[PDB]
Design a protein around this ligand. Structure first.
Ligand SMILES: Nc1nc2c(ncn2[C@@H]2O[C@H](COP(=O)(O)OP(=O)(O)OP(=O)(O)O)[C@@H](O)[C@H]2O)c(=O)[nH]1
Ligand SMILES: Nc1nc2c(ncn2[C@@H]2O[C@H](COP(=O)(O)OP(=O)(O)O)[C@@H](O)[C@H]2O)c(=O)[nH]1
Ligand SMILES: Nc1nc2c(ncn2[C@@H]2O[C@H](COP(=O)(O)OP(=O)(O)O)[C@@H](O)[C@H]2O)c(=O)[nH]1
Ligand SMILES: [Mg+2]
Lengths: 50, 409, 50, 410, 426
């Protein structure tokens, strides 16, 4: 009985361990690229105004 | 709108003796109950305790059906030999109860499958009700035998032979053990020496919480036809774990701060299930949450969000919206002499998962061991059965095990 | 004893009970911040254009 | 003269409409301007309640402003749907919709010149969505040349009431894309978020959400009921917002919305209304418009305002956010002004934006629908009632090609 | 016309600003409920610099409160003139920095300053032609130093062509409340040298000695110090709110007072400041105002200018006065004490007059002197910082949160070149 109790707790602990979120990290990466694109886009436009 | 209740056996009508006490104490809203009942048993001892009890005049004399002699923990006796003379009188009354009714939601049956009357003539009553009405719902709240706590010996034979008909006759089947309820009264209610009376009182609380939507007006009402869709994803998978919160004493209740968030949590821990099984081994297929009393839709909405984002429990890969909520305004009532304190709000959760697949597998070995040596089989066969239905009920539960394993994947 | 040892090392590996929700909620909030920042950068660029 | 009849279906529709008739009755009441334009909503209100559970009808007569409906207009079943679209669309509808069509025809011919019909319902429930859907279909083949409005709430995974929400939402939108003239998409997630952020309520019961939806519905029909410096009826807005006949799902916002703690600390000017109107956190749908573009936009204003301020402000919001609008349509914004404000305010506004970010929700539901329908969960409660397999495939196909044309035009 | 939004950070910033809005509202005749009750038209014509009419005579201050603890915000709305601020302007965290500059600049800043910037952006676009921004904070705390510091850097990147004031109290060894004061001071100033347009150096020692000897107070609670600081801040902006014979806006003073772009830390004084035993025995003349103005003990910083030379100096006078007295007084105080003024700039003192005194006084003044003696403070904190850093004491909350070793070395280097370039230009 005590072995089964301990085993369930290990399985719970393994479930809880943080796991990398692929569907979200790639979003962050894509967001930064568009951000950097707009910065370079902005500097050309400021040059045009002067 | 009305719904009538049938009670079979020593366990059935004692559960009813507490359930109807709560209904009269709780009460146009009464129209769904006022009683539209029938007690029936083979032993006259427990029915005739009602006939002389405090509720002598409350029940019409004919209602209380009673046979001549008991089936004696014998499914075959209570299904083939003695059932055949009393079941016809019972259902030929229940018909005129339905003719009294106009908007019948359904029937609800109370039985314990360990015995002969609760199991045998339970299934027999169910088979003639299914061919007579078909479409009308029949909610069966049954009491299955516990794994380690047990009172009889031949109950594995009864439980398998009863289940074979409980599959395709009842619509919504709620399991309830005795060890799990004993643990509930020991853990939360801190009653170290409980009897059957305390068990039956909190069983009535669950029943009342799922019919209060018909009786009283809430923010989000839910009928008996609603459970029919929202919790059974397959026509032969209807077996529901039950839970309730807050099951709490009279002093602890005032000390603690009962709210919606924590009771939604407490209704999900395996320390509060009405059936001895661990849903950590299983995956939730669907959940249903009846909220009574002082509930706004926001915090119930917020509570189901936290459950979904936790990882201690998991859902099937099929249901992103794996819940069905329901809110009613009137708070739960209390019974003098009862142990549950008055609460502004309570939650009765009815779920469906694959943890139930463990109880059947656990049941199989005990039945299998006895059957292999042909223990006690001579009692049932001389009653009118054969070796055919023993083996065929066995393979029916084998199919059910593979079914749960297939759907759970 | 061996199962107990595996339990303790897995317990240390999860980095705590509350760890998973914090990392999950932090990356979600990070998503929101980049979205907010991207809007302001777009506004500046479009204002420059006019 | 120009007439709008009201239909309320299901529990959601009935309680929303009860609040709706409270605010309209209070709006029409000192002034003689109130008496001249009550034929549009009165003859007793020109409304028809419709449900299957008597608790909602009793709940309607119990509350105040519940004794003003004509009891003959309480057309009403008895058995109940049970969140089953097949029950709401094939079994229970088949004997109650004939009765609703009797009463709706009587309420339509009672007036001289109909402008249109106005339906308030849901897309997750059975007797609200399905029956109201069938009702809409019966109305479309009888009166094709009349206007039609459907304020429909759409379910979100964050506000997940029932288990079969996707099975009902997908089927319901399959009928809306052909039957209704236009629809105003609502949801409970955005409504709850709005009462948190802007309204700052601690206990937002349904009364508040239904009060918010009611303010929108009162705002869209103010031009008929009151004189204005620039009038825009329902047909005028429809042609200015709908570029293609199937692209008629809108997002709505109402202004001004401030907490009772800050009501006296704020100013009420047209620039101040426009900042809150175009705020992405102020849409009453869970579709972030900055995830796409605007096809067109419309702003209905109420109160004595300078029209020049209206036009120059709308031009500004189009020049500043120049990437969020469609290219082959310059001047994407339609505007209108009426001189009578709602009771308790000086100056109000109503935003209707036809954006292409709404395709997120339709795609957002399809993955739940495809999740269930892949392995046939909950399917028999729909199949054994009369529906077949090809209906779900058809419903899925229309969802997919719909998000494609938003994606196409985006 | 020209508009200045107000930004208060941390506990010190919040309490300083509370007394500021009380004093200002009294000058314009707005009661604590937020309605107008003045008499002269001169009060109603220039309240757009600091307020917005909301609805029906409701004037709300154009201010933004920002910190990390709830106690300060609650202490604002409790006291009078606490009900005048718009509740949306209470941008507000919950966890706290704990006098850890990294937590105020890297850990907790990342989740609040975006929200702070939304309110600040709304207050900038709510007005037409910004004159500048006004930030009140400390240099020894965490939530005032780090939070306000990162805010200043981001703001200068958004609106670069606009003025900016930072009223900052600095720590000193004698008044030492926190233990990590040098770590906070040197890093905070390292950011101020490259972000702020001009900064006003304050410290608590001078405030204590003003209330000891000049004011002759017995129990000087923080309400009186904040009362003193508010009079100085109202003086720097009286030119925008009231007409006069010689107006001087913020831009006019900064371009005139700052000879080199990195040398923009000022010493402040205020006149008149008199005790209740001597408020009757005095006169009110321009020369009487001038000597009490240029007094060494009357500086509102504990850095004696008579240890060095003045680079530039400014005077803002308020009240009906004769401009000849203004100009001749500045000329005389420069001719007798000729060695105390820098040589390669003639007429090192710019002066201006405004025709509206503070309520309750006939004639006041405000002094803004950019002297070279300020390097004492930079060395006084620099050696304490180097003393701590050469053994890495208190470093693990800094290096464990995101700073590296080169940041402190960068701080020392920038510290050392500023005190060296002060030494050259003197
Ligand atoms: N919860 C609960 N269970 C009961 C109660 N009484 C009996 N049981 C259960 O009933 C099972 C046996 O069936 P009984 O109801 O006692 O007897 P029966 O079903 O009428 O069958 P017969 O003995 O042949 O008449 C036992 O396993 C008990 O767990 C009760 O009062 N409350
Ligand atoms: N805003 C609002 N939404 C409601 C209200 N009542 C129900 N709903 C929504 O309606 C959905 C359930 O609709 P349902 O009652 O099943 O409709 P019906 O069964 O067809 O009448 C839920 O998602 C609720 O969020 C209400 O009073 N206000
Ligand atoms: N003038 C004044 N200074 C104060 C007050 N309260 C704190 N201080 C100064 O603030 C310094 C400590 O900064 P702290 O209040 O912790 O700043 P914060 O935590 O960033 O808000 C000390 O050197 C005090 O002299 C006040 O009410 N008035
Ligand atoms: Mg018995």
């Amino acid at each position: 009985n005590v072995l089964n109790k301990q085993r369930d707790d290990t399985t719970d602990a393994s479930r809880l361990t943080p796991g990398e979120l692929s569907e979200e990290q790639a979003y962050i990466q894509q967001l930064q690229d568009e951000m950097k694109q707009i910065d370079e886009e902005l500097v050309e436009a400021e040059a045009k105004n002067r | 709108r009305e719904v009538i209740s049938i009670h079979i056996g020593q366990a059935g009508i004692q559960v009813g003796n507490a359930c109807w006490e709560l209904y009269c104490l709780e009460h146009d809203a009464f129209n769904t109950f006022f009683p539209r009942c029938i007690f029936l048993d083979l032993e006259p001892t427990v029915v005739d305790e009602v006939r002389t009890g405090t509720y002598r005049q409350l029940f019409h004399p004919e209602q209380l059906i009673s046979g001549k002699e008991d089936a004696a923990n014998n499914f075959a006796r209570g299904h083939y030999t003695i059932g055949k003379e009393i079941v016809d009188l019972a259902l030929d009354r229940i018909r005129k109860l339905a003719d009294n009714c106009t908007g019948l939601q359904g029937f609800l049956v109370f039985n314990a499958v360990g015995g002969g009357t609760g199991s045998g003539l339970g299934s027999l009553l169910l088979e003639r009700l299914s061919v007579d009405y078909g479409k009308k719902s029949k909610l069966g709240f049954t009491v299955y035998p516990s794994p380690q706590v047990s009172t009889a010996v031949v109950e594995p034979y009864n439980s398998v032979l009863s289940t074979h008909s409980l599959l395709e006759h009842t619509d919504v089947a709620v399991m309830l053990d005795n060890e799990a309820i004993y643990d509930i009264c020991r853990r939360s209610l801190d009653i170290e020496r409980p009897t059957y009376t305390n068990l039956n009182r909190l069983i009535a609380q669950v029943i009342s919480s799922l019919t209060a939507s018909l009786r009283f007006d809430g923010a989000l009402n839910v009928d008996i036809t609603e459970f029919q869709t929202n919790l059974v994803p397959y026509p032969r998978i209807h077996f529901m774990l039950s839970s309730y919160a807050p099951i709490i004493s009279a002093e602890k209740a005032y000390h603690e701060q009962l709210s919606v968030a924590e009771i939604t949590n407490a209704a999900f821990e395996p320390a509060s299930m009405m059936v001895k099984c661990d849903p950590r081994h299983g995956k939730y297929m669907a959940c249903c949450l009846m909220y009574r009393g002082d509930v706004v839709p926001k915090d119930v909405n917020a509570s189901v969000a936290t459950i979904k984002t936790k990882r201690t429990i998991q859902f099937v890969d099929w249901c992103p919206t794996g819940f069905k909520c329901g809110i009613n305004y009137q708070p739960p009532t209390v019974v003098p002499g009862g142990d549950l304190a008055k609460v502004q709000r309570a939650v009765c959760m009815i779920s469906n998962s694959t943890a139930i697949g463990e109880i059947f597998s656990r049941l199989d070995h005990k039945f299998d061991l006895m059957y292999a040596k042909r223990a006690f089989v001579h009692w049932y066969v001389g009653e009118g059965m054969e070796e055919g239905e023993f083996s065929e009920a066995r393979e029916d539960l084998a199919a059910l095990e593979k079914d749960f394993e297939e759907v759970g994947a | 004893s061996e199962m107990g040892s595996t339990l303790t090392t897995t317990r240390n590996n999860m980095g705590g009970i509350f760890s998973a929700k914090e990392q999950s909620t932090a990356v979600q909030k990070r998503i929101k911040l980049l979205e907010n920042r991207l809007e302001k950068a777009y506004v500046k660029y479009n204002q420059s254009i006019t | 003269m120009r007439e709008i009849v009201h239909i309320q279906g299901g529990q959601c529709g009935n309680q929303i409409g009860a609040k709706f008739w409270e605010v309209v009755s209070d709006e029409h009441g000192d002034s003689d301007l109130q008496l001249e334009r009550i034929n549009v909503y009165f003859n007793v209100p020109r409304a028809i309640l419709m449900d299957l559970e008597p608790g909602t009808m009793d709940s309607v007569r119990s509350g105040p402003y519940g004794q003003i409906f004509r009891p003959d207009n309480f057309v009403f079943g008895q058995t109940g749907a049970g969140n089953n679209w097949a029950k709401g669309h094939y079994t229970e509808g088949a004997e109650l919709i004939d009765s609703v069509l009797d009463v709706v025809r009587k309420e339509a011919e009672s007036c001289d010149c109909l402008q249109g019909f106005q339906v308030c319902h849901s897309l997750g429930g059975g007797t609200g969505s399905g029956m109201g859907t069938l009702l809409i279909s019966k109305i479309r083949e009888e009166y094709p040349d009349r206007m039609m409005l459907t304020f429909s709430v759409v379910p979100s995974p964050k506000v997940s009431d029932t288990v079969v929400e996707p099975y009902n939402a997908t089927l319901s939108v399959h009928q809306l894309v052909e039957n209704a003239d236009e629809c105003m998409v609502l949801d409970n997630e955005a409504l709850y978020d709005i009462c948190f952020r802007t309204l700052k309520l601690t206990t937002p019961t349904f009364g508040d959400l239904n009060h918010l939806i009611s303010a929108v519905m009162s705002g869209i029909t103010c031009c008929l009921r009151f004189p204005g410096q620039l009038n825009a009826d329902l047909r005028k807005l429809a042609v200015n917002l709908i570029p293609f006949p199937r692209l008629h799902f809108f997002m709505v916002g109402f202004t001004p919305l401030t907490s009772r703690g800050s009501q006296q600390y704020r100013a009420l000017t047209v620039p101040e209304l426009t900042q809150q109107m175009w705020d992405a956190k102020n849409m009453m749908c869970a579709a972030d418009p900055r995830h796409g573009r605007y096809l067109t936009a419309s702003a209905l204003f109420r109160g004595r305002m300078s029209t020049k301020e209206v036009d120059e402000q709308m031009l500004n919001v189009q020049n500043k956010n120049s990437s969020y609008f469609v290219e082959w349509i310059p001047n994407n914004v339609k505007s209108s002004v009426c001189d009578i404000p709602p009771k308790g305010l000086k100056m109000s506004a109503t935003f209707i934006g036809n954006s292409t970010a709404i395709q997120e929700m339709f795609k957002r539901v399809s993955e739940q629908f495809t999740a269930m329908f892949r392995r046939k969960a909950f399917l028999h409660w729909y199949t054994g009632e009369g529906m077949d397999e090809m209906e779900f495939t058809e419903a899925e196909s229309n969802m997919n090609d719909l998000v494609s044309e938003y994606q196409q035009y985006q």
